[PDB]
Amino acid sequence: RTEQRLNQDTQEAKKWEDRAKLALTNGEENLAREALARKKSLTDTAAAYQTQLA
Amino acid sequence: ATSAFERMENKVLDMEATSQAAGELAGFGIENQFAQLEASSGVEDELAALKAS
């Protein structure tokens, strides 16, 4: 359960990098900055699940 | 969202049951080494046939 949660967050973090790239090709800085804040917070929840899994 | 949580917890129970089935073979050396030897010897036989061809 905690390993599949870690996989779900780590693929979602890569989907927020895809959303950040799409915001940069659109030219929307506020959406690119929100997508960075989504990556920062979701990689922290991934690290919490990885610590619990360890 | 509520019905998706029931689907999620059912698939988590399948993953825990799958992990328990894998743990029944973990450290069970006789079946673990038998499966490894069957796979290894099957690949070596396929490569021996490829070298003969």
What is chain A's alpha carbon radius of gyration, rounded to the nearest angstrom? 13
Instruction: Please choose, from the candidates A5, A34, A7, the residue with its C-alpha nearest in 3D space to the C-alpha of residue A22.
Output: A34
Q: Kindly provide the resolution of this structure in angstroms, with one decimal.
A: 7.0
CA–CA separation, A11 and A43 (whole Å): 10
- Residue of A1, A3, A6, A49 to mutate for B, most B C-beta atoms under 10 A: A1
Chain B positions touching A1 (Cβ under 8 A) are 12, 15-16
CA–CA separation, A15 and A6 (whole Å): 14
Q: Note whether A7 and B15 are within 8 A (CB).
A: no
Token pair 């003969």: residue: B52
Question: Taking the CA of residue B45 as centre, how many other CA atoms within 13 Å lie in the half-sphere pointing to its CB?
Answer: 6
Written as one letter, the residue type at B1 is A
CA–CA separation, A35 and A20 (whole Å): 5
Q: How many CB atoms lie within 10 A of CB B15?
A: 12
Q: Note whether A9 and A46 are within 8 A (CB).
A: yes
